[PDB]
From a paper:
Here, we report the structure of the native [name] mastigoneme to ~3.0 Å resolution. Our structure of the [name] mastigoneme filament demonstrates that it consists of multiple copies of [name] around a central single copy of [name]. The structure reveals that [name] copolymerizes with a second HRGP, [name], that likely tethers mastigonemes to the membrane through a PKD-like domain. Both proteins exhibit poly(proline) regions that form linear PPII helices, with all proline residues having been converted to O-glycosylated hydroxyprolines.
We traced each mastigoneme filament in cryoSPARC24 and extracted particles along their length with an arbitrary step size. A multi-step processing procedure revealed helical symmetry with a rise of approximately 380 Å and a twist of 172°, creating a filament that is 12 nm at its widest and 6 nm at its thinnest. By exploiting D1 symmetry and using masked local refinement,25 we were able to improve the resolution of the mastigoneme to between 3.0 and 3.1 Å. Residues 43–1,175, which are predicted to be rich in β-strands, form nine consecutive immunoglobulin (Ig)-like domains (D1–D9). Residues 1,176–1,853, rich in cysteine residues, form a single 26-nm domain belonging to the growth factor receptor cysteine-rich domain family with 26 disulfide bonds. Residues 1,854–1,932 form a single, 22-nm long, linear PPII helix, as described in detail later. The mastigoneme filament can be characterized as a double helix with two non-polar [name] polymer strands that intertwine in a spiral pattern. The fundamental repeat unit within each strand is an antiparallel homodimer formed through an extensive interaction between central cysteine-rich domains. Based on the appearance of the electron cryomicroscopy (cryo-EM) density, all proline residues within the PPII helix are glycosylated. The most likely interpretation is that each serine is O-glycosylated with a single galactose moiety, which is a plant- and algal-specific post-translational modification found on members of the HRGP family. Our analysis revealed unassigned density occupying the central shaft that strongly resembles, and can be partially modeled by, a glycosylated PPII helix.
Residue numbers in the entry:
A (entry chain A): 1407 to 1648
B (entry chain B): 1601 to 1794
The structure:
Amino acid sequence: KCPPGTYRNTWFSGQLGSPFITADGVPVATTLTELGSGCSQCPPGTYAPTFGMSVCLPCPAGTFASAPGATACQQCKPGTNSLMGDRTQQMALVVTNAANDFPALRAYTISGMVAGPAYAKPIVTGPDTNFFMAGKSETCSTNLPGYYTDVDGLPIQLPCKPGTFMPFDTATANLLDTGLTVDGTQCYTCQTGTFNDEFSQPVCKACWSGSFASKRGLPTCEIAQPGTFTNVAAAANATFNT
Amino acid sequence: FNDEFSQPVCKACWSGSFASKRGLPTCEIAQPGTFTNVAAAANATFNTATLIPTGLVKGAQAPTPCGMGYFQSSAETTTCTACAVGTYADQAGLAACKPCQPGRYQNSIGQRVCKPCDMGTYSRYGGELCTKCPAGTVASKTGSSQCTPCAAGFYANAPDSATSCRACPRGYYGPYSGAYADNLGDEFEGPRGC
Ligand SMILES: *[C@@H]1O[C@H](CO)[C@@H](O[C@@H]2O[C@H](CO)[C@@H](O)[C@H](O)[C@H]2NC(C)=O)[C@H](O)[C@H]1NC(C)=O
Ligand SMILES: *[C@@H]1O[C@H](CO)[C@@H](O[C@@H]2O[C@H](CO)[C@@H](O)[C@H](O)[C@H]2NC(C)=O)[C@H](O)[C@H]1NC(C)=O
Protein backbone atom coordinates (compact mmCIF):
# COMPACT_ATOMS: atom_id res chain seq x y z
CA LYS A 1 0.00 0.00 0.00
CA CYS A 2 1.09 3.56 -0.69
CA PRO A 3 2.33 5.42 2.40
CA PRO A 4 -0.02 7.97 4.01
CA GLY A 5 0.13 11.35 2.35
CA THR A 6 0.41 9.78 -1.11
CA TYR A 7 -1.99 8.26 -3.62
CA ARG A 8 -1.72 6.09 -6.72
CA ASN A 9 -4.42 6.01 -9.38
CA THR A 10 -4.35 4.72 -12.94
CA TRP A 11 -6.40 7.48 -14.55
CA PHE A 12 -4.61 10.49 -13.04
CA SER A 13 -1.66 11.50 -10.88
CA GLY A 14 0.42 14.50 -9.87
CA GLN A 15 -0.62 17.57 -7.93
CA LEU A 16 -2.76 20.55 -8.92
CA GLY A 17 -1.39 23.50 -6.99
CA SER A 18 -3.29 26.30 -5.31
CA PRO A 19 -4.52 28.85 -7.88
CA PHE A 20 -5.03 31.65 -5.33
CA ILE A 21 -1.31 31.93 -4.46
CA THR A 22 -0.35 32.73 -8.07
CA ALA A 23 -0.77 36.10 -9.76
CA ASP A 24 -1.82 34.31 -12.95
CA GLY A 25 -4.68 32.50 -11.23
CA VAL A 26 -4.12 29.28 -13.21
CA PRO A 27 -3.27 26.36 -10.89
CA VAL A 28 0.23 25.10 -11.61
CA ALA A 29 0.45 21.32 -12.00
CA THR A 30 3.35 19.48 -10.37
CA THR A 31 4.43 15.84 -10.14
CA LEU A 32 5.84 15.54 -6.62
CA THR A 33 6.08 11.87 -5.64
CA GLU A 34 7.30 9.91 -2.65
CA LEU A 35 10.91 8.82 -3.11
CA GLY A 36 10.96 5.19 -2.01
CA SER A 37 7.45 4.19 -3.04
CA GLY A 38 6.76 6.25 -6.16
CA CYS A 39 3.14 7.14 -5.46
CA SER A 40 2.18 10.71 -6.30
CA GLN A 41 2.05 13.03 -3.31
CA CYS A 42 -1.33 14.28 -2.17
CA PRO A 43 -2.23 17.67 -3.72
CA PRO A 44 -2.50 20.78 -1.53
CA GLY A 45 -5.84 21.22 0.18
CA THR A 46 -6.30 17.44 0.44
CA TYR A 47 -4.92 14.92 2.91
CA ALA A 48 -4.27 11.17 2.66
CA PRO A 49 -4.53 9.82 6.22
CA THR A 50 -4.70 6.06 5.67
CA PHE A 51 -2.42 3.52 4.00
CA GLY A 52 -2.75 3.07 0.25
CA MET A 53 -5.78 5.06 -0.92
CA SER A 54 -6.62 5.72 -4.55
CA VAL A 55 -7.73 9.35 -4.23
CA CYS A 56 -7.12 12.19 -1.78
CA LEU A 57 -9.83 13.27 0.65
CA PRO A 58 -10.53 17.03 0.46
CA CYS A 59 -10.16 18.73 3.80
CA PRO A 60 -13.36 19.41 5.76
CA ALA A 61 -14.70 22.94 5.92
CA GLY A 62 -12.88 24.79 8.67
CA THR A 63 -9.58 23.00 8.00
CA PHE A 64 -6.73 23.71 5.60
CA ALA A 65 -3.82 21.82 4.03
CA SER A 66 -1.03 23.81 2.39
CA ALA A 67 1.71 21.26 1.62
CA PRO A 68 1.83 18.35 -0.84
CA GLY A 69 1.31 15.32 1.38
CA ALA A 70 -0.38 15.94 4.71
CA THR A 71 -1.94 12.75 6.20
CA ALA A 72 -4.07 15.30 8.09
CA CYS A 73 -4.93 19.01 7.89
CA GLN A 74 -5.01 21.39 10.83
CA GLN A 75 -7.94 23.56 11.85
CA CYS A 76 -8.15 27.24 10.99
CA LYS A 77 -6.96 29.48 13.80
CA PRO A 78 -9.66 31.57 15.51
CA GLY A 79 -10.39 34.68 13.51
CA THR A 80 -9.75 32.83 10.24
CA ASN A 81 -11.99 30.77 7.98
CA SER A 82 -11.75 28.30 5.07
CA LEU A 83 -12.76 30.18 1.92
CA MET A 84 -11.28 30.26 -1.57
CA GLY A 85 -8.61 32.94 -1.79
CA ASP A 86 -7.46 35.28 0.94
CA ARG A 87 -9.56 38.09 2.41
CA THR A 88 -8.48 40.58 -0.26
CA GLN A 89 -9.47 38.37 -3.20
CA GLN A 90 -12.89 37.30 -1.94
CA MET A 91 -13.66 40.96 -1.18
CA ALA A 92 -12.40 42.22 -4.55
CA LEU A 93 -14.39 43.29 -7.60
CA VAL A 94 -11.81 44.40 -10.21
CA VAL A 95 -10.15 41.98 -12.65
CA THR A 96 -6.46 41.60 -13.47
CA ASN A 97 -6.25 38.47 -15.65
CA ALA A 98 -8.94 39.08 -18.27
CA ALA A 99 -8.75 35.44 -19.39
CA ASN A 100 -10.52 34.09 -16.30
CA ASP A 101 -11.68 37.17 -14.32
CA PHE A 102 -9.03 36.56 -11.66
CA PRO A 103 -9.17 37.59 -8.87
CA ALA A 104 -12.73 39.00 -8.88
CA LEU A 105 -14.03 36.47 -6.37
CA ARG A 106 -17.24 38.39 -5.71
CA ALA A 107 -18.12 36.47 -2.56
CA TYR A 108 -18.73 39.31 -0.06
CA THR A 109 -21.98 41.18 -0.72
CA ILE A 110 -23.41 43.44 1.99
CA SER A 111 -26.63 45.44 1.68
CA GLY A 112 -26.43 49.02 2.91
CA MET A 113 -26.41 52.66 1.95
CA VAL A 114 -24.15 53.46 -1.00
CA ALA A 115 -22.68 56.58 -2.59
CA GLY A 116 -25.57 58.95 -3.18
CA PRO A 117 -28.89 58.94 -1.33
CA ALA A 118 -29.87 55.62 -2.93
CA TYR A 119 -29.92 52.48 -0.77
CA ALA A 120 -28.81 49.36 -2.65
CA LYS A 121 -29.54 45.81 -1.52
CA PRO A 122 -27.21 44.01 -1.96
CA ILE A 123 -24.33 46.30 -2.98
CA VAL A 124 -22.90 43.45 -5.10
CA THR A 125 -25.31 41.45 -7.24
CA GLY A 126 -25.07 38.44 -9.51
CA PRO A 127 -24.92 34.66 -9.24
CA ASP A 128 -22.33 33.95 -6.57
CA THR A 129 -19.82 31.35 -7.80
CA ASN A 130 -16.73 31.13 -5.58
CA PHE A 131 -18.36 29.76 -2.44
CA PHE A 132 -16.41 26.56 -1.76
CA MET A 133 -15.30 25.89 1.81
CA ALA A 134 -13.86 22.36 1.67
CA GLY A 135 -10.58 22.66 -0.19
CA LYS A 136 -8.48 25.34 1.51
CA SER A 137 -5.17 24.85 -0.28
CA GLU A 138 -3.48 27.99 1.09
CA THR A 139 -3.21 29.85 4.38
CA CYS A 140 -6.57 30.54 6.00
CA SER A 141 -8.24 33.77 4.94
CA THR A 142 -9.20 36.48 7.40
CA ASN A 143 -12.88 36.76 8.26
CA LEU A 144 -14.92 39.21 6.21
CA PRO A 145 -16.28 42.32 7.93
CA GLY A 146 -19.32 41.37 9.97
CA TYR A 147 -18.24 37.83 10.83
CA TYR A 148 -16.24 36.21 13.62
CA THR A 149 -14.64 32.87 14.50
CA ASP A 150 -14.11 32.57 18.25
CA VAL A 151 -13.07 28.89 18.43
CA ASP A 152 -10.62 27.32 16.01
CA GLY A 153 -12.00 24.78 13.56
CA LEU A 154 -15.40 26.35 12.93
CA PRO A 155 -16.73 25.33 9.49
CA ILE A 156 -18.30 28.67 8.56
CA GLN A 157 -17.65 32.11 10.03
CA LEU A 158 -20.61 33.02 12.14
CA PRO A 159 -22.42 36.35 11.74
CA CYS A 160 -22.56 38.97 14.46
CA LYS A 161 -25.82 39.01 16.38
CA PRO A 162 -28.05 42.11 16.19
CA GLY A 163 -26.84 44.81 18.52
CA THR A 164 -23.20 43.91 17.82
CA PHE A 165 -20.98 44.78 14.87
CA MET A 166 -17.58 43.87 13.50
CA PRO A 167 -15.58 46.32 11.36
CA PHE A 168 -13.10 45.50 8.62
CA ASP A 169 -10.12 46.74 10.65
CA THR A 170 -9.31 48.87 13.68
CA ALA A 171 -7.91 51.64 11.48
CA THR A 172 -11.09 51.76 9.38
CA ALA A 173 -13.45 51.22 12.33
CA ASN A 174 -15.36 54.50 12.23
CA LEU A 175 -17.11 54.22 15.62
CA LEU A 176 -15.00 52.13 18.00
CA ASP A 177 -13.45 52.94 21.36
CA THR A 178 -9.77 53.80 21.53
CA GLY A 179 -8.66 50.78 23.54
CA LEU A 180 -10.41 48.12 21.45
CA THR A 181 -8.83 46.26 18.54
CA VAL A 182 -10.36 43.79 16.09
CA ASP A 183 -8.80 40.46 15.09
CA GLY A 184 -11.59 38.14 13.87
CA THR A 185 -12.76 36.57 17.15
CA GLN A 186 -14.72 39.38 18.84
CA CYS A 187 -18.12 41.01 18.37
CA TYR A 188 -18.29 44.56 19.72
CA THR A 189 -21.52 46.04 21.03
CA CYS A 190 -23.01 49.01 19.23
CA GLN A 191 -21.89 52.35 20.65
CA THR A 192 -24.34 54.20 22.88
CA GLY A 193 -26.53 56.41 20.74
CA THR A 194 -26.38 53.90 17.86
CA PHE A 195 -28.03 50.56 17.15
CA ASN A 196 -28.07 47.58 14.81
CA ASP A 197 -30.83 45.08 14.01
CA GLU A 198 -29.27 43.05 11.17
CA PHE A 199 -26.89 40.10 11.39
CA SER A 200 -23.35 40.60 10.09
CA GLN A 201 -23.06 44.38 9.90
CA PRO A 202 -19.63 46.02 9.57
CA VAL A 203 -20.86 49.24 11.19
CA CYS A 204 -23.52 50.37 13.64
CA LYS A 205 -26.48 52.46 12.52
CA ALA A 206 -27.03 56.00 13.77
CA CYS A 207 -30.30 56.49 15.63
CA TRP A 208 -32.55 58.86 13.69
CA SER A 209 -33.67 62.18 15.13
CA GLY A 210 -36.75 61.76 17.29
CA SER A 211 -35.34 58.57 18.84
CA PHE A 212 -32.45 57.63 21.11
CA ALA A 213 -30.26 54.71 22.19
CA SER A 214 -29.40 54.98 25.88
CA LYS A 215 -27.86 51.51 26.27
CA ARG A 216 -24.91 49.72 24.71
CA GLY A 217 -25.67 47.16 22.02
CA LEU A 218 -29.33 48.04 21.53
CA PRO A 219 -31.02 45.82 18.90
CA THR A 220 -33.59 48.56 18.24
CA CYS A 221 -33.65 52.29 18.87
CA GLU A 222 -36.00 53.71 21.50
CA ILE A 223 -38.82 56.06 20.51
CA ALA A 224 -38.76 59.36 22.40
CA GLN A 225 -41.70 59.52 24.79
CA PRO A 226 -44.22 62.39 24.77
CA GLY A 227 -42.88 65.49 26.46
CA THR A 228 -39.34 64.81 25.22
CA PHE A 229 -37.55 65.12 21.90
CA THR A 230 -34.22 64.49 20.18
CA ASN A 231 -32.80 66.07 17.03
CA VAL A 232 -29.12 65.92 16.06
CA ALA A 233 -28.32 67.20 12.58
CA ALA A 234 -24.94 65.45 12.32
CA ALA A 235 -26.45 61.99 12.90
CA ALA A 236 -26.36 59.90 9.72
CA ASN A 237 -25.85 56.31 8.66
CA ALA A 238 -22.50 55.11 7.33
CA THR A 239 -22.17 55.03 3.54
CA PHE A 240 -20.37 52.18 1.79
CA ASN A 241 -17.58 52.87 -0.69
CA THR A 242 -18.75 50.83 -3.67
CA PHE B 1 -31.12 62.54 40.75
CA ASN B 2 -33.18 64.07 43.54
CA ASP B 3 -36.32 63.04 45.42
CA GLU B 4 -36.67 65.63 48.21
CA PHE B 5 -38.43 68.95 47.70
CA SER B 6 -36.40 72.17 47.75
CA GLN B 7 -32.87 70.90 47.43
CA PRO B 8 -29.90 73.16 46.62
CA VAL B 9 -28.08 70.30 44.86
CA CYS B 10 -28.84 66.94 43.28
CA LYS B 11 -27.42 63.66 44.56
CA ALA B 12 -25.15 61.39 42.54
CA CYS B 13 -26.40 57.90 41.79
CA TRP B 14 -24.61 55.31 43.91
CA SER B 15 -22.49 52.54 42.43
CA GLY B 16 -24.80 49.85 41.14
CA SER B 17 -27.37 52.24 39.65
CA PHE B 18 -27.69 54.91 36.97
CA ALA B 19 -29.77 57.93 35.96
CA SER B 20 -30.22 57.87 32.18
CA LYS B 21 -32.68 60.79 31.98
CA ARG B 22 -32.72 64.35 33.24
CA GLY B 23 -34.73 65.17 36.35
CA LEU B 24 -35.11 61.60 37.56
CA PRO B 25 -37.15 61.47 40.80
CA THR B 26 -35.55 58.14 41.73
CA CYS B 27 -32.34 56.51 40.52
CA GLU B 28 -32.96 53.29 38.58
CA ILE B 29 -30.99 50.19 39.55
CA ALA B 30 -28.88 48.24 37.07
CA GLN B 31 -30.63 45.25 35.53
CA PRO B 32 -29.09 41.76 35.71
CA GLY B 33 -26.19 41.27 33.33
CA THR B 34 -25.09 44.90 33.72
CA PHE B 35 -23.05 46.75 36.33
CA THR B 36 -22.30 50.39 37.12
CA ASN B 37 -19.54 51.71 39.37
CA VAL B 38 -17.84 55.11 39.52
CA ALA B 39 -15.38 55.35 42.41
CA ALA B 40 -15.20 59.14 41.98
CA ALA B 41 -18.98 59.54 42.57
CA ALA B 42 -19.42 61.95 45.51
CA ASN B 43 -22.62 63.42 47.00
CA ALA B 44 -22.25 67.10 47.95
CA THR B 45 -21.14 67.95 51.49
CA PHE B 46 -22.68 70.99 53.12
CA ASN B 47 -20.33 73.62 54.52
CA THR B 48 -21.77 74.07 58.01
CA ALA B 49 -20.51 77.66 58.29
CA THR B 50 -22.21 78.88 55.11
CA LEU B 51 -24.77 76.13 54.33
CA ILE B 52 -23.35 75.84 50.81
CA PRO B 53 -23.19 72.38 49.19
CA THR B 54 -20.02 71.40 47.36
CA GLY B 55 -18.22 68.35 46.02
CA LEU B 56 -20.93 66.70 43.93
CA VAL B 57 -19.53 64.43 41.21
CA LYS B 58 -21.88 62.93 38.63
CA GLY B 59 -22.44 59.19 38.91
CA ALA B 60 -23.06 56.50 36.33
CA GLN B 61 -25.12 57.53 33.30
CA ALA B 62 -25.62 54.25 31.41
CA PRO B 63 -25.16 50.62 32.46
CA THR B 64 -21.96 48.85 31.49
CA PRO B 65 -22.72 45.42 29.99
CA CYS B 66 -20.44 42.68 31.26
CA GLY B 67 -17.69 41.69 28.85
CA MET B 68 -17.24 38.33 27.15
CA GLY B 69 -16.67 35.48 29.57
CA TYR B 70 -18.41 37.26 32.46
CA PHE B 71 -21.96 37.01 33.77
CA GLN B 72 -24.01 38.83 36.40
CA SER B 73 -26.88 36.91 37.98
CA SER B 74 -28.09 39.60 40.40
CA ALA B 75 -29.12 43.23 40.01
CA GLU B 76 -28.01 46.19 42.20
CA THR B 77 -24.41 45.07 41.64
CA THR B 78 -21.12 46.87 41.05
CA THR B 79 -19.16 44.10 39.29
CA CYS B 80 -19.68 40.73 37.64
CA THR B 81 -17.83 37.48 38.25
CA ALA B 82 -16.07 35.23 35.78
CA CYS B 83 -18.28 32.39 34.62
CA ALA B 84 -18.05 29.19 36.64
CA VAL B 85 -15.88 26.45 35.19
CA GLY B 86 -17.97 24.25 32.92
CA THR B 87 -19.92 27.26 31.60
CA TYR B 88 -19.14 29.98 29.08
CA ALA B 89 -20.34 33.49 28.21
CA ASP B 90 -20.04 34.10 24.46
CA GLN B 91 -21.93 37.42 24.52
CA ALA B 92 -21.89 40.78 26.31
CA GLY B 93 -24.19 41.49 29.24
CA LEU B 94 -25.43 37.99 30.07
CA ALA B 95 -27.87 37.38 32.92
CA ALA B 96 -26.54 33.86 33.55
CA CYS B 97 -24.03 32.33 31.18
CA LYS B 98 -25.07 29.15 29.42
CA PRO B 99 -23.57 25.73 30.20
CA CYS B 100 -21.44 24.05 27.58
CA GLN B 101 -23.49 22.03 25.12
CA PRO B 102 -23.17 18.22 25.20
CA GLY B 103 -20.04 17.04 23.46
CA ARG B 104 -18.04 20.06 24.65
CA TYR B 105 -16.23 20.92 27.87
CA GLN B 106 -14.57 23.92 29.51
CA ASN B 107 -11.93 23.32 32.20
CA SER B 108 -11.25 26.99 32.97
CA ILE B 109 -12.81 30.05 34.58
CA GLY B 110 -13.97 33.08 32.63
CA GLN B 111 -13.72 31.47 29.20
CA ARG B 112 -16.05 32.51 26.38
CA VAL B 113 -15.76 29.25 24.40
CA CYS B 114 -16.22 25.53 25.06
CA LYS B 115 -13.48 23.22 23.86
CA PRO B 116 -14.66 20.12 21.96
CA CYS B 117 -14.28 16.66 23.43
CA ASP B 118 -11.48 14.57 21.94
CA MET B 119 -11.90 11.17 20.32
CA GLY B 120 -13.02 8.36 22.60
CA THR B 121 -14.67 10.72 25.09
CA TYR B 122 -18.15 12.15 25.60
CA SER B 123 -19.87 14.80 27.68
CA ARG B 124 -23.42 15.89 28.50
CA TYR B 125 -24.58 19.42 29.35
CA GLY B 126 -22.03 21.30 31.42
CA GLY B 127 -19.00 19.18 32.15
CA GLU B 128 -15.78 19.74 34.07
CA LEU B 129 -13.82 17.41 31.77
CA CYS B 130 -14.59 15.11 28.87
CA THR B 131 -15.73 11.85 30.43
CA LYS B 132 -13.65 8.85 29.42
CA CYS B 133 -16.15 6.64 27.64
CA PRO B 134 -16.80 3.49 29.71
CA ALA B 135 -15.65 0.02 28.74
CA GLY B 136 -17.60 -1.64 25.94
CA THR B 137 -18.67 1.62 24.28
CA VAL B 138 -17.01 3.73 21.61
CA ALA B 139 -16.95 7.41 20.59
CA SER B 140 -15.32 7.58 17.16
CA LYS B 141 -15.94 11.29 16.49
CA THR B 142 -14.68 14.33 18.37
CA GLY B 143 -17.35 16.14 20.37
CA SER B 144 -19.64 13.13 20.79
CA SER B 145 -22.68 13.72 22.99
CA GLN B 146 -22.69 10.05 24.01
CA CYS B 147 -20.70 6.94 23.15
CA THR B 148 -22.70 3.97 21.79
CA PRO B 149 -22.14 0.30 22.67
CA CYS B 150 -20.14 -1.85 20.30
CA ALA B 151 -22.38 -4.03 18.15
CA ALA B 152 -22.65 -7.78 18.63
CA GLY B 153 -19.82 -9.61 16.93
CA PHE B 154 -17.61 -6.54 17.33
CA TYR B 155 -15.20 -5.38 20.02
CA ALA B 156 -13.90 -2.02 21.19
CA ASN B 157 -10.29 -1.27 20.30
CA ALA B 158 -9.36 -0.17 23.84
CA PRO B 159 -10.40 -1.25 27.35
CA ASP B 160 -11.25 2.36 28.22
CA SER B 161 -12.20 5.31 26.00
CA ALA B 162 -12.45 3.31 22.79
CA THR B 163 -12.01 5.10 19.47
CA SER B 164 -13.16 2.44 16.99
CA CYS B 165 -15.05 -0.86 16.86
CA ARG B 166 -13.50 -3.76 14.96
CA ALA B 167 -15.02 -7.02 13.79
CA CYS B 168 -14.03 -10.24 15.52
CA PRO B 169 -11.40 -11.95 13.33
CA ARG B 170 -11.50 -15.30 11.55
CA GLY B 171 -12.07 -18.09 14.05
CA TYR B 172 -13.54 -15.83 16.76
CA TYR B 173 -17.06 -14.85 17.76
CA GLY B 174 -18.56 -12.06 19.83
CA PRO B 175 -21.79 -13.18 21.49
CA TYR B 176 -22.57 -10.05 23.50
CA SER B 177 -22.77 -6.46 22.38
CA GLY B 178 -20.48 -4.03 24.13
CA ALA B 179 -17.45 -6.30 23.83
CA TYR B 180 -14.05 -4.72 24.39
CA ALA B 181 -10.46 -5.81 23.96
CA ASP B 182 -8.12 -6.12 26.94
CA ASN B 183 -4.39 -5.41 26.97
CA LEU B 184 -3.74 -8.27 29.39
CA GLY B 185 -3.50 -11.65 27.71
CA ASP B 186 -4.17 -11.86 23.99
CA GLU B 187 -4.95 -8.49 22.41
CA PHE B 188 -7.91 -9.88 20.44
CA GLU B 189 -9.97 -11.06 23.43
CA GLY B 190 -11.60 -9.62 26.52
CA PRO B 191 -13.89 -10.58 29.40
CA ARG B 192 -16.80 -10.23 26.96
CA GLY B 193 -14.65 -9.68 23.86
CA CYS B 194 -14.12 -11.98 20.92
C1 LIG C 1 -29.99 54.47 9.68
O1 LIG C 1 -30.67 53.44 9.00
C2 LIG C 1 -31.74 52.91 9.76
C3 LIG C 1 -32.20 51.62 9.10
O2 LIG C 1 -32.70 51.90 7.82
C4 LIG C 1 -32.83 53.96 9.90
O3 LIG C 1 -33.81 53.53 10.82
C5 LIG C 1 -35.13 53.74 10.30
O4 LIG C 1 -35.55 55.07 10.48
C6 LIG C 1 -36.88 55.33 10.07
C7 LIG C 1 -37.11 56.83 10.11
O5 LIG C 1 -36.14 57.47 9.32
C8 LIG C 1 -37.83 54.53 10.96
O6 LIG C 1 -39.18 54.73 10.61
C9 LIG C 1 -37.53 53.06 10.76
O7 LIG C 1 -38.30 52.25 11.60
C10 LIG C 1 -36.06 52.78 11.07
N1 LIG C 1 -35.73 51.42 10.75
C11 LIG C 1 -35.24 50.53 11.63
C12 LIG C 1 -34.98 49.16 11.07
O8 LIG C 1 -35.02 50.80 12.80
C13 LIG C 1 -32.24 55.25 10.47
O9 LIG C 1 -33.14 56.32 10.36
C14 LIG C 1 -30.94 55.66 9.78
N2 LIG C 1 -30.35 56.75 10.50
C15 LIG C 1 -30.33 58.02 10.06
C16 LIG C 1 -29.65 59.01 10.99
O10 LIG C 1 -30.81 58.37 9.00
C1 LIG D 1 -26.29 60.55 48.16
O1 LIG D 1 -26.82 60.57 49.46
C2 LIG D 1 -28.14 59.99 49.48
C3 LIG D 1 -28.69 60.20 50.88
O2 LIG D 1 -29.35 61.44 50.94
C4 LIG D 1 -28.19 58.53 48.96
O3 LIG D 1 -29.50 58.04 48.75
C5 LIG D 1 -29.65 56.65 49.17
O4 LIG D 1 -28.53 55.85 48.85
C6 LIG D 1 -28.59 54.49 49.24
C7 LIG D 1 -27.27 53.88 48.84
O5 LIG D 1 -26.23 54.49 49.56
C8 LIG D 1 -29.76 53.81 48.54
O6 LIG D 1 -29.96 52.50 49.00
C9 LIG D 1 -31.03 54.59 48.83
O7 LIG D 1 -32.11 54.05 48.11
C10 LIG D 1 -30.86 56.05 48.44
N1 LIG D 1 -32.06 56.79 48.72
C11 LIG D 1 -32.92 57.18 47.77
C12 LIG D 1 -34.12 57.94 48.28
O8 LIG D 1 -32.78 56.95 46.58
C13 LIG D 1 -27.41 58.38 47.66
O9 LIG D 1 -27.17 57.05 47.31
C14 LIG D 1 -26.08 59.07 47.86
N2 LIG D 1 -25.17 58.90 46.76
C15 LIG D 1 -24.02 58.20 46.87
C16 LIG D 1 -23.19 58.14 45.61
O10 LIG D 1 -23.65 57.67 47.90
